[PDB]
Amino acid sequence: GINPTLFIAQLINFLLLIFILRALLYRPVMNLLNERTRRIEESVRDAEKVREQLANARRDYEAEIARARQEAAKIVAQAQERAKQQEAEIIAQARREAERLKEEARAQAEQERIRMLSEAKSQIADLVTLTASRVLGAELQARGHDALIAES
Amino acid sequence: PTLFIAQLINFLLLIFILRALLYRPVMNLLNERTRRIEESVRDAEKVREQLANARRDYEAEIARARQEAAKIVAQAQERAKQQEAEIIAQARREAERLKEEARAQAEQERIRMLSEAKSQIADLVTLTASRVLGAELQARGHDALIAESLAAL
Amino acid sequence: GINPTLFIAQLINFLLLIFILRALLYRPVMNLLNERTRRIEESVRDAEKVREQLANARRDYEAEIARARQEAAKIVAQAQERAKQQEAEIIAQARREAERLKEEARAQAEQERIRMLSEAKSQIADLVTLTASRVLGAELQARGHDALIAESL
Amino acid sequence: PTLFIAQLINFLLLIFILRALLYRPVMNLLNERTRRIEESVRDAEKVREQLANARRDYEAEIARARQEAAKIVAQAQERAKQQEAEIIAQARREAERLKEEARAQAEQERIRMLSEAKSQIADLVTLTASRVLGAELQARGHDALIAESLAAL
Amino acid sequence: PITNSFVVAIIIDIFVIALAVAATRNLQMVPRGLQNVMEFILESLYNLFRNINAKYVATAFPLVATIFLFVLFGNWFGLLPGVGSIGVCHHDTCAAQGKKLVPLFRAPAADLNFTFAIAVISFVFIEYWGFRALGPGYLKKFFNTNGIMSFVGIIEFISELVKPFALAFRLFGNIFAGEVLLVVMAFLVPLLLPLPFYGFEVFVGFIQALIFALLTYAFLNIAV
Amino acid sequence: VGALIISIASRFFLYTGPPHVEVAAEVIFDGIPGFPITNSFVVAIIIDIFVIALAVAATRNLQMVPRGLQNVMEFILESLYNLFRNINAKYVATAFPLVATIFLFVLFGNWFGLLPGVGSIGVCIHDTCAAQGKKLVPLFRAPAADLNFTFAIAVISFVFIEYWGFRALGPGYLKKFFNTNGIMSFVGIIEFISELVKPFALAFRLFGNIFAGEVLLVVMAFLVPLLLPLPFYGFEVFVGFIQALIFALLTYAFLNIAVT
Amino acid sequence: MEGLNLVATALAVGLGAIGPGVGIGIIVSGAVQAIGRNPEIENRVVTYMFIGIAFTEALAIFGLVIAFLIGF
Amino acid sequence: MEGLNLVATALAVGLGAIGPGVGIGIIVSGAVQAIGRNPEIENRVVTYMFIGIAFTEALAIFGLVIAFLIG
Amino acid sequence: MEGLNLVATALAVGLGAIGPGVGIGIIVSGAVQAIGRNPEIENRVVTYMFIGIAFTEALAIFGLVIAFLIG
Amino acid sequence: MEGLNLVATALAVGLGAIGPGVGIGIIVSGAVQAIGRNPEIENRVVTYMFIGIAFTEALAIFGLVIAFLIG
Amino acid sequence: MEGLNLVATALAVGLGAIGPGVGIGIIVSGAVQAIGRNPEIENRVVTYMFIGIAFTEALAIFGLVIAFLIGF
Amino acid sequence: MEGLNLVATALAVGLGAIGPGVGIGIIVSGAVQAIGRNPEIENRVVTYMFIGIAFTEALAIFGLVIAFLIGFG
Amino acid sequence: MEGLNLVATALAVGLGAIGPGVGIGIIVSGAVQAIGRNPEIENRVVTYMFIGIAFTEALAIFGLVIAFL
Amino acid sequence: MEGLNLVATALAVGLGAIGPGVGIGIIVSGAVQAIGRNPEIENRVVTYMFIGIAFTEALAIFGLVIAFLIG
Amino acid sequence: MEGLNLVATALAVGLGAIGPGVGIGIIVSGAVQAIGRNPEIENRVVTYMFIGIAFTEALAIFGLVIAFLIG
Amino acid sequence: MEGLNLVATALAVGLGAIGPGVGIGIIVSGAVQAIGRNPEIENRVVTYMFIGIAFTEALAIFGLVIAFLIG
Structure with missing residues (x-):
């Protein structure tokens, strides 16, 4: 109880359905694959963003450290210049005092001895x-x- | 026939009755799967947003570093002013001590003479x-x- | 072949044989087994008792020696106490003799004074x-x- | 009929085969069981003899220890008497020494006076x-x- | 003209293109609706196809995947009750004045050709790949390879040839199994008796489509 | 020796000389008023006498040192005593000789089955008694072939089971009786039916086994003159020894079952 | 014959249920063993537990139904 | 062949009782082998144990009912 | 013929004892290994053995009643 | 029918013996394997062996009595 | 004799399927215990679980198909 | 049906013992399996070994003896 | 008579099938145990399982074709 | 009905052989499994190897001899 | 009978096919489980497996050719 | 009826061979299990493997010649 014509008709219908389904679903399979695979590029972008944030934090820390070092160097240089000027002035004043006061004391002692x-x-x-x-x-x-x- | 219709109706009713109870948890599972796929998409969007805003984060970090640099420069200026004031005060004190010593030495030399x-x-x-x-x-x-x-005698 | 008389005769023969075996076979065999088990248990108990008896004999010999030593020590102590009492009596007699000697010395001094x-x-x-x-x-x-x-x- | 003869021949052959192999192992097993039983019986007899001889030896050792203790006690009594005599003699000798010393000191005191x-x-x-x-x-x-x-000069 | 079973060969075949068009229309990330749970099993089947072989996931996937997807609805199509309860005429509905009562509302997969249509498509494409990959090696006689070991190639090739015939027959028998079981409880009871295994048979039919898909994967596995 | 195995002497009156079957279900000596004598029962008395004679010899001149039959019977009895103790010592000594009496009689019965020549032995091819006009009443029927004797032993074993059942929960045996609810009622009823069948089973068990060796020996004799039966007889002798051990063991098992 | 249909009806019904009756007997036997060891993969292994039962029970219905084609 | 129905009647009754009769034997053997293993998931798998028993007992039903159709 | 009812009596009784005759053997063998492993759950688990036969023994008695009906 | 009952009698006994005869092979061999594994437990586990045996042995005897009844 | 195909058309389906109705149970339960140790290995196992089942059920098909090639 | 009783007396003798013809080997195997693992229980377990041996063989004799009712009345 | 051939057709089909119907099931399940053991030798043994399948399944189809003749 | 004795001969020939013909391998397999268990003990283990064989090989010949009587 | 030889043709082909149909399966799967455990001695095993295969495959052809002669 | 001997030919050839033929596999599967663990005892058990084959194949080829003896 098998009809070759009916069998051929059923086979043709099945083959047409299969070919049409393949043609229609070739695009949908690739679409779903791309939708799933977008997460790989997302992870790559996240890793790049993490690396960029780490580099930015390192650059900010380095800038802060360099600024602190330059600030300390400037403060030290200013303190050293002030100390050098102060020491030079103190030495000059001490020399001037030790010269002029001693000479005047000797002269006054001689004058007072002569007057006495x-x-x-x-x-x-x-x-x-x-x-x-x-x-x-x-x-x-x-x-x-x-x-x-x-x-x- | 009547028996065939009754059997088909009873089979369909039993199928629907089982289907509702099974699909309750099955709808829960399908909603969970859809939520998981949407969460993957949301993680992708968040990664893209972080990649885009990395420039803004770097700008904020650079601004923080510049503020730290300004604070360090201000602290350096304050420390330089304080150290210069201390040096000037010490120089004035030492000069006054030397001048007092010189005047005292002159007076002592006069007294000794x-x-x-x-x-x-x-x-x-x-x-x-x-x-x-x-x-x-x-x-x-x-x-x-x-x-x-x-008279000594 | 479902004759019940032959079955009854066979049952009677089996019961008689069982009774005979209980009287003859079972009783002597059970007696021999019980005798062997009792002999083994008695041998184990006798070995333990012999070890215990040897240990107790050694302990008893030591205890008798100790009791004899204690009695001898008591006798020696009583003798030593009696000897100490006798020595004290001798010392007292010596002290009395020394007192008599001192009295004789005083008498000699009196005689010397008389001779003076x-x-x-x-x-x-x-x-x-x-x-x-x-x-x-x-x-x-x-x-x-x-x-x-x-x-x- | 010849069936009985054939059965007898087969039975004789089977008996010969069994005696060829089973007789030696069955005899060995019976001999081993008999040897184990004999060893157990000899061990039990030796244990009983050891227990009896141990009781006898314990009694003998008790008697020997009692005799030794009696000898020790007699020696203790004799030594006590001898030591009492020795102490009395030493006391008498010391008393005689003291009396002689008193007499000598008295003569010396008379001479000194x-x-x-x-x-x-x-x-x-x-x-x-x-x-x-x-x-x-x-x-x-x-x-x-x-x-x-x-003026002798 | 053709038989009612061949007439029923387009009831789901039209929907097969329509569903794939719907699949083409509905295929995206986190798709809710036409691509929510079925695609997850399809991806798992694709993972199962990947579990078979990476090449097998695409060597004859168009020749395989659609039929299993179609038979997945086709298995659900067979489970529908009441289709043919009244004679279509090409004291019951059509017992009086019988016009042969040819009901087109019946499973076309019950025809052995419909099972063989998917079966031959996968078998030939695997054989064509088998011709491409192995060819003579697929039926490698290996005459006296290991001391008269030639029977390995001859028997297996006959068995492999029998397997594609059996696969079509087994699916046809499985299709016939549901059709036979359809009237099993019908004369037995008037209500709710067929429900005891009809869904299980539909699940088995769904498994049968998966088994056919597995067989398609297996045939590729054999081709590999 | 070597390859001297020939054994071609079978073809000498093996088939024509011996009868085809000449077998029977049971043999009765009869010839006695009142109770009809049975050649199996007559052999049983002879078996009982020989067993009693074996018991008498060991009992006579009994000594502490085991030797000869005394040593042999001891290890024979001790292993069974050990086995019963190993099986269930709660009431092992209660009926220890009773199982042994079953064991010894069957062991004698197996030995009685091992006795050759009983086949052609019989009073009235053609043979002698069959050649004679009167019916060839065979002599020395197998005592173990008396299924009634096995049935009597089994009934006694059932009575022994009943006596144990009379001890099993006293007269109660409630688990053996029935259960109120649960599946234990159907199983317990089946088990009680099974227990009843078990006594009838053992009697049928040994009876066929006893009849098998006689059948096998006759079959082997009708087949071969002497070669095959010798290998066959030893198997039956071991089987008879096993079945004899198995018989009382099942009773001990029934006692062990009744112990539960 | 008159009852040749009837014995053929009892032929397939009585026969066909045996092996599948054993077959499901085999499956759930080791299944509980598998589930007894791991109660968590139950949901994973019960999934494959019944796919064989889906096959195995269905096989016994084959001659069952065919004998019902002899039943009437 | 007048009793051909009668031999037909008792034909399937004993046949179908065998395999499922074995089948219940297999399942409970494997089940009990695991029940002692796992008294925890026991109550969950005791239900699993009776799943195939219902399947097998239903198979034994099919032979008996058709016998009453003939008997 | 004649013994068609009589052979029917042989069928179900003869056939039915086989599978349960195997199936009962299967469970207790598997039970004992479980019982030997776990004699503590024994009372809880041999209940399944005690009800395991009930799933199968009732099947074995299907023909026995029918045999007496033909009896 | 020329000895059809003779045929009929000669079937059920031969039928319902292989199954239980297998069932004896299952339990005790599995039991001994467990007892070999577990020499400790021997009181109720061995009892579980024999109660199934009594259940098993009875199966082989159902039609054996009925055989001579028709016989 | 009369209607001799009646038993014949019911014969092979009752016989030829039960053995196949057993081996799948062996295939399944053995796999169930096999997969009961590694669940995720199903990807390599379940694919081989059905290839024999396909061969096994094909034997069950033979009883069905010839039941009408002789049945008709 | 001249050989019917001859067929009948050859019916159960072929059957019946098949299960014991298999079950004994199982009884042999697992016991032999057990003693290989457990040689010390051999003084006690071999007793259990022959327990089912009698159980198997006793049913196996039925096909012989009961068929002789057919063969010999 | 008049159907013995029809009887003979279902004879070998119903009989011989269960051999491989069980034997292959043992082979496959045994293979699954072997694959459950290791899929490393799978190339050798799945083919060797197919070797046994070729050994077994060929026997099963012996009476199928003959019955048509 | 000629040849009814000839088929009657082959009855116990086939059935009586398969049963024992299977258990022997189980005897063999069980032994050879235990041979790998402990070749240490062979005199008091392989002793049991032929114990069941006598219960098995001789059991098959029961139907063999009675079938030749039909022959 | 007219088809008695035709029936006799189909017996042994159907009959003997089960043994090698199962025994080789036991041979194969037993080896496959053994070889799957360790393929080191596989070459020895496969030769010994083929030894068992040859001891069984020839049995499957005993009545196979014989039936074709009668056919 | 002119072919029962031809039927009886396929009986003894077919039946009596499945069991022993499968029993070979039990020997084989048991062997390769033991062979899978020990090659040194193999040569001791090749004979023990041959013990089974001699026990198996001898009973297997009983009815083959017997069929020709009565054919």
Whole structure:
């Protein structure tokens, strides 16, 4: 109970359905494959973004470190220049003082010695006090001796 | 026939009755699978957004680094001002100490010269007195020491 | 062949054989097995008891030796106590003898003091001769003084 | 019929085959069981004999230890008596030594008292001679011959 | 003209192109609707096709995948009750004045050619690939290869030839199994008796389509 | 020796000389008023006497040292005593000789079956008694072939099972009786039916086994003169020894079953 | 013959259920063994547990139905 | 062949009782072998155990009912 | 013929005892290995053995009733 | 029918013996294998062996009694 | 004799399928225990699980087809 | 049907023992399997070995003896 | 009579099929155990399983073709 | 009905051979499996190898001899 | 009978096919499981497997040629 | 009826060969299982393998010659 004509008709219908289905679904299979495979490019982009963020963080840290180093170097240079100028000024002032004050002290000592040497009235008063001091006192000398005054 | 219709109706009813109860969990599973595929798509979109905004994140990091640089420069300026002020103050203090020491040394030199002059004047007065003591003794007579020597006995 | 009489006869024969075996075969075999098991158990128990008996004999010998030693030590201690008492009695007798010796020494001292009374008989004349001996050339007489000798001390 | 003859021939052949192989192993197994039973019986007999001899030896050792303890106790009593005698003898010897020492010390004390009394009498005689002769030489013995004696040269 | 079974050969065949067109219209990431759960099994079948061989996933996939996809609905098509309960006429509905009551509302896969149509398409394409890949090696006699070991190639090639014939027959028998089982509970009971295994048979028919797809994968596996 | 195996002497009155079958289900000696004598039952008394004679010899001159039959019977009895103790020592000594009496009689019965020449032995090809006009009443029928004797033993075993059943939960045997609910009721009823069948089974078990060796020996004799039966007889002798051991073992197993 | 259809009807029905009756007997036997070891892959292995049962039970219906083609 | 129905009647009754009768034997043997293994998933797989028993017992039903159709 | 009913009596009883005669053998063998492994779940698991025969023994008695009906 | 009952009697006994005869092979061999694995458990596991045997042995005897009844 | 094909048309289907109705159960349950240790290996196993089943069920087909080649 | 009883007496003798003809080998195997693993229980398990041997063989004798009712009345 | 050939047709088909109907099932399941053991020798043994299939399945079709003759 | 004895001969020939003809391999397989278990013990293991063979080889010849009687 | 030889033709072809149809399956799968466990001694096994195959394949051809002569 | 001997020819040739023929596989499968673990005992068990073959094939070729003896 098998009809070759009916068998041929059924085979033709099945073959036409299969060919049409293959032609229609060749595109859909590739579409689904691309939709699934987009995640691979997504992961590649995510890895690239992570690498870029890490590079940006490293660059920011390096910039902060370099800025801190330059700031410290500038502060150190300014402090060193200020200290050098201060030390030079202090040394110059100390030298000027030790020179001028000492020279003026020596000159004033010499002048005061000369004036006191000129101020022999106290030395004359000293000789007057020395007169009759337990000698030429109760028994005074014969008219004294002006030579000591002459010596003075 | 009537029996065939009844059998077909009962089979369809049983099929639907089983299908609803089975499809409840099956609809849950299908919704879970759709949600998983949508979550994969959302992860793809988030990765793309992160890749796009990497430039903005780098700009923000560069801005933070520039702000840190400005803060470091301000701290350097403040430290330089403080160190310069400390150096100037120390220099002024040392100069004042040196000037006070110089003035004190000058005054002490004046005092020492005065004291040395006083001692030298005392010595010279004794010498000048001795220079005329012999002449005074010769003029007034030396028998007083002989009288003094006798008074010693 | 479903004859019941033959079945009954066979059953009777089997029952009689079983009774005979219980009387003859089963009883002697059970007796022999029980005797063998009892002999084995008795041998094990006897070995354990023999080891225990040897250990107990050694322990008893040691204990008898210890008891004898304890009794001997008690006898020795009693003898030592008696000897100590005798030695104390001897020491007391020695102390009494020493006291008697001291008393005899005191009596001898008293006898010596009594003999010192003979000095009046002798030492008076001994001194009188000694005074003559003291007088070089034997002056004595007028040069001597018997009253001073009579004065004595 | 010949069936019985054939059956007998087959039975004889089977018996010969069985005796060829099974007889040796069955005999070996029976001999092994008999040997095990005999070994167990000999072990039980030896254990019983050992237990009996051990009880006998324990009694004998108890008797020997009792005899040794009795000998020890007798030796203890004899040593106690001997030590009591020795202690009494040592005490008597020490007492005799003390008594002899007392007698010797008494003789020494008598001699010492005699010597001490002699020395005291001599000192008294010397003192009395000094008193009397000095009194005698003062006036009674006062003669110029004293200077002549001093002038011996 | 042709038989009612050959007439029924386009009831699902038209929908087969329509479903693939719907599959072409509905195929995207996270597709909800026509491509939600069926494509997941299809991808698993593609994974199963990948589990067979990477080449087998595309060597004759157009010659294989559509038929299994069609028979998946075709298995569901057979499970439909009441189709033919009244005679179509080419005291029952058509018992009186019988016009042979040829019902076109019947499973065309029940025809052995319809099973053989998918079977021959996969078998020949595998054989053509087998001709391309092995050819003579597919039926390599290997005369006295290992001391008269030539029977390996001859028997297997006959068995392999029998296998494509059996595969068409087995699917036809499986198709006939459901058709026979359709009236099994019909005269037995008037209600709900066929439901005990009709869905299971449909699942088995769905498995049979998968088995045919597996056989297509297996034939490629044999071709590999 | 070597390849001297010929054994071609079979063709000597092997087929024409021996009868075709000449077998029977049972043989009765009869010739006695009241109870009819049976050649199997007569052999059983002879078997019982020989077993008693074996028992008498070991019992006579009994000594502590095991030797000869005393040593042989000991290890024979001890293993069975050990086996029963290994099986179930709760009531092993309760009926230890009873199983042994079953064991020894069957072992004697197997030995009785091993006795040759009983076939042609019989009073009235043609043979002698069959050649004679009177019916060839065969002599020395197999005592073990008496299925009634096995049935009597099985009934006694069933009685022994019943006596154990009388001990099994006392007179209760409730699990053996029935169960109230659950599947245990159907199984227990089946088991009780199975237990009842089990006594009848053992009797049928040994009876066919006993009859088999006699059938096999006759069959072998009708087939071959002497060669095949000798290999065949040893198998039956081992089988008879096994079945004898198996017989009381099943009773012990029934006792072990009744122990539960 | 008069009952030759009837014995043929009892032929396929009685016969066909045997092997498939054993076949399902085999399947679930080792299945519970597999599920008993791993209760978690139950959902994975019960899936393949019944696909054979789908085959195996169906085979017994073949001669069952064919004998019903002799039943009436 | 007047009793041809009768021999037909008892034909399938004993036949179909064999394989499923074996089949229940196989399943419960494997089931019980795993029930002692897994008393935990027991209550889950006791239901699994009776799944094939229902399948096999239904097969034994088919032979008996058609016998009553003939008997 | 005549013994067609009589041979029918032989059929189901003769056939039916086989599969259960195997199937009962299968379970207890598998049970004992499970029982030997787990004698603690034994009471819980031999219940399945006790109900396992009930799934099968009832099948074996299908022809026995019918045989007596033909009896 | 010229000894049809003779044929009929000679079937069921030969039929219902192979199955149970197999079933004995299953249980005890599986039991001994378990007992070989587990010498410890021997009290109720061995009992489970014999209760199935009694269930198994009875199956082979169903038609054997009925054989001589028709016989 | 009369209608001799009646038993014949029911013969092979009852016989020729039960053995195949067993081997699949062996195929399945053996695989079930095999896959019961590795579930994900089904990709290589389930594909080989059905190739024999295809051969096995093909034997079951033979009883069905000749039941009408002789049946008609 | 001149050979019908001859057929009948040859019916159950072929059958019946097949299962025991197989089951004994199973009984042999697993026991032999068991003693290979467990040689120490051999003094106790070989007892269990012959338990089913009697069970198998006893049913196997039925095909012989009962068929002799057919062969010999 | 008049159907013995028709009887003979279903004879070998129903009989011989179960051999491979079981034997191949043992082979395949045994192969699955072997594949479950290792798929490394799968190239050798799946072919060797097919070798046994060629050994077995060929026997199964012996009576099928003969019955048509 | 000629040849009815000739077929009657072949009855026990085929059936009586397959049963024992299977168990022997099981005896062989069980032994050879245990040979690999422990070749250490061979005198008291392979002893059991031929124990079942006598229960098996001789069992088959039961129908062999009675069939020749028909012959 | 007119088809008795025709029936006799179909017996042995159907009959003997099961043995090698199963025994070789046992030969193959037993070896396949063995070879699958270890293919090292496979070449020895395959030769010994072919030894078993040859001991069984020839049995399948015993009545195969014989039937064609009668045919 | 002019062909029962021809039928009986296929009986003894067919039947009695499946069992032993399968039993060869049991020997073979059991061997390769043991062969799969030990080649040194192999030469000791090649004879033991030949023990089974001699036990198997001898019974196998019983009815083959017997069929010609009565054919």
